[PDB]
């Protein structure tokens, strides 16, 4: 049961606030649309940011991956600053029924801390990250101030 899974997951996240992950339904009309958020990793250009991720869980969840895309405009090799689309294996080909939405959200936070330019969503941003890190970081940090406040 998708619904049974989701309500368990909601409780698991609500009871552990210090993890700085949140999970909420979008509306009262269903339980398959949610918003997840996580805080930017400290010591990182994204520190101080709060990142919001749109989640749609499929009928087959947890045996199919949830559809996740950023609502927050982020400057990052694996996230589209236009569509919020994410390039991350667990969301595509490496999904496992044991993975939770909280876990996925934590993996997205880990993605901010450790960009994966070798499989970019945005080729230019991945190119920027590699070509001129210092300049990349200044942009990521400005965008965190602008769009993730």
UniProtKB/Swiss-Prot annotation:
Listed GO CC annotations: cytosol; nucleus
Recorded GO MF terms: ATP binding; proteasome binding; ubiquitin conjugating enzyme activity; ubiquitin-protein transferase activity
Cross-link position per record: Glycyl lysine isopeptide (Lys-Gly) (interchain with G-Cter in ubiquitin): 92
Keyword Ribonucleoprotein listed: no
Reactions that this protein is recorded to catalyse: S-ubiquitinyl-[E1 ubiquitin-activating enzyme]-L-cysteine + [E2 ubiquitin-conjugating enzyme]-L-cysteine = [E1 ubiquitin-activating enzyme]-L-cysteine + S-ubiquitinyl-[E2 ubiquitin-conjugating enzyme]-L-cysteine
Positions of the catalytic residues: 87
GO biological process, one term: ubiquitin-dependent protein catabolic process
Induction: By heat shock and cadmium.
Pathway as given in its UniProt record: Protein modification; protein ubiquitination
UniProt domain UBC core: residue ranges: 1-149
Alphabetical keyword list: ATP-binding, Isopeptide bond, Nucleotide-binding, Stress response, Transferase, Ubl conjugation, Ubl conjugation pathway
EC number: 2.3.2.23
Additional record remark: Present with 8940 molecules/cell in log phase SD medium.
Family: Belongs to the ubiquitin-conjugating enzyme family.
Function: Catalyzes the covalent attachment of ubiquitin to other proteins. Functions in degradation of misfolded or regulated proteins localized in the endoplasmic reticulum (ER) lumen or membrane via the ubiquitin-proteasome system. Cognate E2 conjugating enzyme for the HRD1 ubiquitin ligase complex, which is part of the ERAD-L and ERAD-M pathways responsible for the rapid degradation of soluble lumenal and membrane proteins with misfolded lumenal domains (ERAD-L), or ER-membrane proteins with misfolded transmembrane domains (ERAD-M).
Protein's name according to its UniProt entry: Ubiquitin-conjugating enzyme E2 1
Upper taxonomic lineage: Eukaryota, Fungi, Dikarya, Ascomycota, Saccharomycotina
The encoding gene: UBC1
